Amino acid sequence: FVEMVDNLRGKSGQGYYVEMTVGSPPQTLNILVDTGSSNFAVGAAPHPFLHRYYQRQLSSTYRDLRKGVYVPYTQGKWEGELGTDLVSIPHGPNVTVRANIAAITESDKFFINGSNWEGILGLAYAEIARPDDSLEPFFDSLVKQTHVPNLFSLQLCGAASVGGSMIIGGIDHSLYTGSLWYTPIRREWYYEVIIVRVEINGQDLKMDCKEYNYDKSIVDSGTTNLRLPKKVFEAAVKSIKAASSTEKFPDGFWLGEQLVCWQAGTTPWNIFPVISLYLMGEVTNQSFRITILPQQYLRPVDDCYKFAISQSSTGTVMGAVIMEGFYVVFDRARKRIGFAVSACHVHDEFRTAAVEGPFVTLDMEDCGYN
């Protein structure tokens, strides 16, 4: 899979994108990689933020589905016109498939001023596709029309340019150390998982585990932060505050209202605690844990940083803060997600991100919200 290594680019806070082509002859576009949605949607009009856009009038293979799609989401919206066309990934498998493409014709707070991407590749499942589950997601078409195995993995590396790898149809063993540990995909809509225990510097938060997954937990390459349900965010911050009490920061810092800065090269990593999420394992009463560093949850912006853990009303979102520590395998074929220590995660000489197990955890099914 050497061809696919380093096929992801981005800027901090603006997501990870992959090069794709659409139409005949192929039109090159950079596309945001998003495991937290299920539509392939591309700029199709000359929005001033866009480097380029899909021009259907130049594609001999374009087919108009004669249907609109209207996709408001939490932080923005896009609307467009559904069709199909030939789609390939130059630094992906050597294949081309006919996929659904939403040609974006109106939008608000969707495109980022200064970004280098023009569209969005929703890698999650048909259940949450717009307008409905009859609109086959890209990855489903890829697997259905080719021999590409039904899995992909992401290595997101971070720093200001970021980079990473999207391995389509496989696992590249050079991208991780130690073993992969798998947690079940609870339901095929989002990439939903179940967190069964939370530790700050090894100290259990001692919350009812349902709270950790209220109303769901998801693995989301399209979110920068680790987002936590309100009640869990309260406890997490209280514990991280206590752990980091050597140095006092404004209350706003913890809420993402302001940045904290240190002299270039003297960030006190060691006063900040590690954060461990235990995930439901593959076997009854068995779990594993993934552990991230402040290198992951304190994000560059003197060296100044943003606290990149935040409260949610939509459940836990394991965003880039989690994923940048790990090689993450979206094993759709076996309805499971693998975690392993990432060969590229940022760390120091004292601590590294970790994936460890097995542990004994009882009543893990009670942790899921219904």
Ligand SMILES: CC#Cc1cncc(-c2ccc3c(c2)[C@@]2(COC(N)=N2)c2cc(C4=CCOCC4)ncc2O3)c1
């Ligand atoms: C890592 C990272 C990142 C990142 C940084 N800046 C902006 C984005 C971004 C841009 C457009 C965008 C989305 C994110 C976003 C929001 O969260 C996720 N997972 N995808 C998104 C989600 C949706 C959805 C439509 C229907 O429900 C599911 C999600 N539609 C459009 C979207 O556009 C991602």
